[PDB]
Symmetry: C3
């Protein structure tokens, strides 16, 4: 007799592990986490700031950092508006709003992130969470938390923030999960955590429309929910029906 | 009989606690600390940089960071002056001094700060505290300390630094006090300290004159001693005579 | 009798200790470490960024940070090129290469540095070490290590990096050695390490030619190997033949 039906089936498995690798890769300690801060402007276009780090992504946008471009030609206008906002009434500023101050923020946070410890806070013009610094803290009662970000998958969550005023700024923290109960802020591991956490702030990108934006998010595999509330990217691997 | 003289006196106490709150609020762990770095220029006006953080405010101004505005129209002039200063004699620079290099620094430090551990250092053109980097350290023997800052109150101290040259830069550290003997750089607390310490550097503000400056310091409740050595703001709460 | 041949010989020793001081000075804990990142451009000139810190020098250059000057007059060109590079094909960019993107990097690292823990990595256009962020880590398999930097002396090593493409960026880490087996990331010492590590990024300097560059490196006593592979500066003290 003879048994010729021994076609190997390792290929299926190799591809399968490549698929799992993309989903589990982010969960290895010192794997990269990736956050996209996306501002929407009055011209309907976007400015996207891409962050990555292996321990935690924190940072801020002061009031000035919120603006669309802030070119030399508009520096005086922006200076005076900033004066009026951050020190009324000392700005030679003649309009209630700037064309270049955003109308909303979208945040795509991706990776092995401790959602419980995530903080996203819309601060005032001095980047504080209280009117008086003497009552301000690291984070306040109006802070956004991880569970408030819309879940796209196990890898990514997405937050929408309307800006109904033009005096606000932004402060955020997206920290890694540890490996089980191993706190790497222990003496064994903390030196490496501190020295490895180089928080990359890539130069802001300008995207004309939401089609181009969806394309970017899908290209970089960062989760995105479009203006119609449809999840177009969730950070996960491609697959066919099970 | 009847006892109609029972007018409540809780109101006095409520206001009183609001007053104490502003003075004690800064002393809660993870309360915000606030520092204003103020440069004075040859046009008699000011450039103010507002910092806040919950663990410690450190940072620096390299030589270029010292300048008033540094607009594109003056970029070449400033580049060449920087060359001559930081690498003599390689600058096509034709004047001993720049109009836009400051003549003095004022620092208003406010909050629950460990004054013993405060460091403010006027560095050389390479932002080092010795002529030769091989003898330079984190801090040097000419470093300003907390006790050298003029005390305005329990909440705030104020330092004046004359700049008699135009080759100097700045490095500083304003760290929080701990709660008694609880070192939060212990393994229990340090992760939070590190991830919470997002040092906000607000965009520099331009203030025309000292009247406008006093107004700002009083509005933001940051301590200030004016050019006549009078304490105009001390970070404390308003009150009537005791 | 009389013994008039008692000419003192302390002077020799005083100078000798001054010489040793420059070589050993960097090895005191909290002594400064100094790193020069030097880019070479298509006009044959250099842009040098001078860093110093007492605990560790880490940082990065995102893609935009790589460019020579990036003046307002060339902002549009640079924006569009960045678009095409970081999000193809969304840049209105008409040339394969920019005049202002560097052709090589030279890194002079100097001081009491733990060469074993040094990391210098040429990242892609998103400043990641893998094509897909989900497989990216703090550092990757193509990372440069301390032993790959050409040794100039006990104080300094020098690395050359050719840039054969124009999509790459940079991330680096140069950490201090500890005093023997005393890990200052222990609870006793870590607060000071964290608060003292103010990583100075001096404004980029523009140097016309290699003669001017050699002069700078020798003036600042940072190690340098010239285009002919000759060590012109090694960070050590001057001396006569032994
Ligand atoms: O960030 C921005 C940028 C531009 N702009 C808008 O650009 C326009 C350019 O200014 P104008 O076109 O109105 O010229 P102008 O000299 O009359 O300016 P003002 O009298 O208003 O000072 C201004 O009217 C302003 O509203 C903003 O409001 N915000
Ligand atoms: O930061 C600054 C800004 C401006 N300035 C001053 O602005 C003035 C503008 O320069 P000028 O008005 O003298 O024109 P110019 O072409 O003659 O310039 P030079 O011959 O001096 O190169 C210069 O004389 C300079 O002293 C500074 O010195 N420092
Ligand atoms: O970073 C830089 C800076 C300058 N340049 C170069 O400067 C030159 C200035 O551009 P041109 O002198 O070609 O004028 P132009 O209006 O024809 O520009 P294009 O048609 O090429 O858009 C361009 O040809 C560009 O190649 C760079 O390529 N990269």
């Amino acid at each position: 007799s003879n048994q010729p039906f021994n076609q190997p089936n390792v290929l299926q498995e190799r591809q399968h592990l490549v698929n799992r690798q993309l989903v589990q890769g982010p969960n290895v300690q010192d794997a990269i986490k990736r956050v996209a801060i996306i501002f929407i402007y009055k011209n309907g276009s976007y400015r996207l700031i891409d962050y990555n780090a292996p321990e935690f992504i924190n940072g801020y946008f002061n009031w000035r950092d919120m603006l669309y471009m802030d070119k030399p030609a508009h520096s005086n206008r922006h200076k005076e508006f900033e004066n009026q906002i951050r020190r009324p009434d000392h700005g030679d500023s003649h309009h209630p709003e700037l064309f270049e101050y955003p109308v909303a923020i979208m945040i795509s946070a991706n990776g092995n992130i401790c959602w419980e410890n995530v903080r996203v806070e819309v601060e005032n013009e001095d980047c504080l969470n209280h009117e008086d610094w003497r009552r301000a803290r690291a984070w306040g009662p109006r802070c956004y938390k991880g569970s408030q970000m819309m879940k796209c998958s196990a890898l990514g969550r997405f937050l929408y923030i309307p800006l109904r005023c033009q005096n606000e700024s932004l402060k955020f923290k997206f920290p890694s999960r540890m490996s089980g109960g191993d706190n790497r802020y222990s003496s064994h591991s903390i030196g490496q955590v501190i020295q490895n956490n180089i928080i990359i702030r890539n130069n802001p990108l300008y995207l004309d429309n939401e089609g181009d934006l969806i394309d970017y998010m899908q290209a970089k595999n960062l989760c995105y929910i479009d203006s119609a509330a449809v999840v177009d990217c969730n950070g996960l691997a491609g697959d066919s029906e099970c």
